[PDB]
Design a protein around this ligand. Structure first.
Ligand SMILES: *Cc1c(COP(=O)(O)O)cnc(C)c1O
Ligand SMILES: *Cc1c(COP(=O)(O)O)cnc(C)c1O
Ligand SMILES: O=C(O)CCCc1ccccc1
Lengths: 388, 394
């Protein structure tokens, strides 16, 4: 039986972990001055508090715990959370939220298609391929200006049919780092409303862009216009609990009836996949969010991280500027999030990794959190050496 | 679009507790619970587990992404706990999953990848979630006779006759021990014969192992699995740490793929890592780490085995007590099966009608198929259950 198993292609981004004066600029995890991904202060305190308060580990809720569901809703939608018409499902990380999102939509529309950005998180297409869902792309990254080809994007999206799903990154677009402004978001909402396409928002970096509330701005605008929208959130990065596997799927419906319908299907979806969702991570998140003292320090630490990385981009761009006398790499300072695509070709990037020992994702995607004052000039020189 | 959704039925377990709570009777009893409960009606956190969580809190320095298929310490410790000295790593693939249920879902997905025309055989009866997951996947499900309603024991003759019909490439799901919901179990000699049937048919064994340590002991409960593992070249095992470690909500389990050779093992392992990746990327870390900590740390392990044994013996005492009470009140040994059953569950064999009469007249609740949880019994509740059973005419 098993001998008939066909070999499968690995995760190229995760492969870099294996492929690693080495400079790690691959996998999207935050790193500090000394190349460490620390546990946030609030998270540690949450765990300590949990170690004392929990008296049992019996089966809990199939859709996650109410405290988590509520906390997460308010974090993402703020005061735009109409719980009466919102369904929530605790999933195994943001990735689980996406898979669960695709399954839910496919249940309501066997003939659904998914539109993804050119380019997008490869794992998006991987999952869709596995499920056998037709994937179409829309123009997004303007290769020349390193910005967003808004004209192209609006053009392709206008071709989506009712029942189709459009996958938008809430903010901090992985892998480009190029993001839409709120004005562009309003226009996109105009298109979606007219096309009847279901918006699927992948929110994995709320807090690394421009701030907790600012990064959720776009998602809130869509939710305020479009009567039905899906949001897949990840607590992996903004809470630094990557290995805990915690996120959630939010299903915004047009009315309570549909909400009860969706919520039912979402719970059933967990039951048939792995039964209950993991408790530990969801608990840390709600504990932090519902405890004023814990929330205050978390926001602060996330702010320091976010502001610190902002500083790094400016340095890197400046370094390169002084090393070329050209505003070419200006896009680095404009980009927002953890990543930024240098625009280097596959031949160049490979040369860099083998000789310079600096490993970045094949499409020239660099994790700016992997840089620091010591490595910045080295990277600048390394890319200056060839092309760019 | 979401309005086109089909109304999905509730989990039912909630509906059970719904009527129970609504019951104004001060002396009502709940034997329908599916988790373990101590003398005080609580599901405590095992001592070793609270110890592991304390050490993890002090030593963990990061929470970055870890093993896609799980961590090595967990995989090895688990394979050893299940297969003992018989663990042949060279041909064994391992996958940390989201609980035993996740392990089951992945096993089915894996097999279906290897054989599109996969057909599954499940016992009569079996854990309802088995059928639901399979129906959801659209896999053809077959049943094999297992529970004898009259003796409350295993209908082996019938089991053999039905399993004989399995074809090359079909899957046969076996409960490694403590059969949920029945409580009736196969002896090592019956396992040997089942082994011969599977060898002849060329069917792939999928062993569901969720109660290791609740039957006769850790080693004894793995006995059947180990006989199969040694005689059958390809075997899939879905283990759960929920019950025997008491970490239900943490969602810890693992899929073990025993292969004929290393080339196949590499094929299976990759396919499993891919399956995890295409579902939720990485499996939950916390629960698995508690487990690897208890099993590797001699002190904790010793205290865990000690606590599990206490739990196991306690339930066995309850079985003997209830069976004894039933013997005196009935003037016969007709209810002896209660003491022969292993696991925390037992199917009494009462008709849905008798079950309803038991609830209304004695305030004793249980699942509709007459399945009761031994752990929910105690010196005060046993005399009552004994009398209810006999008075209703079971
Ligand atoms: C991180 C990330 C996710 C989800 O990550 P999980 O580890 O599964 O929480 C989803 N999409 C993108 C773009 C991400 O960067
Ligand atoms: C409990 C149980 C499982 C596993 O439960 P998980 O909670 O998902 O670890 C699987 N099969 C049977 C028969 C069970 O009783
Ligand atoms: O680096 C990234 O793209 C996102 C972080 C790494 C990954 C996580 C999950 C699946 C992949």
């Amino acid at each position: 039986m098993l001998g008939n198993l066909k070999p499968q292609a690995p995760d190229k981004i995760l492969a870099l972990m294996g492929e690693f004066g080495k400079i790690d600029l691959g996998v999207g995890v935050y790193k500090d001055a000394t190349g460490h991904t620390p546990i946030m202060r609030a998270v540690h305190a949450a765990e300590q508090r949990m170690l004392e308060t929990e008296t049992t580990k019996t089966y809990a809720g199939l859709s996650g715990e109410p405290e988590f569901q509520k906390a997460m809703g308010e974090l993402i939608l703020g005061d735009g959370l109409k719980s009466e018409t919102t369904a929530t499902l605790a999933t195994v990380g943001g990735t689980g939220a996406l898979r669960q999102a695709l399954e839910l939509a496919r249940m309501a529309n066997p003939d659904l298609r998914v539109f993804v950005s050119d380019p997008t998180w490869p794992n998006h297409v991987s999952i869709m391929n596995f499920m056998g869902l037709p994937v179409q792309t829309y123009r997004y990254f303007d290769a020349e200006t390193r910005g967003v080809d808004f004209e192209g994007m609006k053009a392709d999206l206008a071709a989506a049919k009712k029942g189709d799903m459009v996958l938008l990154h809430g903010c901090c677009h992985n892998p480009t780092g190029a993001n839409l402004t709120l004005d562009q978001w309003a226009e996109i909402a105009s298109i979606l409303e007219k096309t009847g396409a279901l918006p699927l928002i992948d929110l994995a970096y709320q807090g690394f862009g421009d701030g907790l509330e600012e990064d959720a701005a776009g998602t809130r605008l869509i939710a305020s216009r479009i009567p039905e929208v899906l949001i897949a959130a990840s607590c992996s990065k903004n809470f630094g609990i990557y290995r805990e596997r915690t996120g959630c799927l939010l299903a915004l419906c047009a009315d309570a009836a549909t909400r009860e319908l969706a919520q039912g299907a979402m719970a059933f979806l967990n039951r048939q996949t792995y039964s209950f969702p993991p408790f530990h991570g969801a608990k840390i998140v709600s504990t932090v969010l519902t405890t004023p003292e814990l929330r205050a320090d978390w926001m602060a630490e996330l702010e320091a991280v976010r502001s610190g990385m902002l500083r790094l981009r400016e340095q890197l761009a400046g370094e390169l500027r002084d090393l070329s006398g050209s505003d070419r790499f200006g896009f680095v300072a404009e980009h927002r999030g953890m990543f930024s695509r240098l625009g280097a070709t596959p031949e160049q990037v490979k040369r860099i990794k083998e000789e310079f020992g600096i490993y970045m994702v094949g499409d020239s995607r660099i994790n700016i959190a992997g840089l620091n004052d010591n490595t910045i000039p080295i990277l600048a020189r390394a890319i200056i050496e060839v092309g760019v």
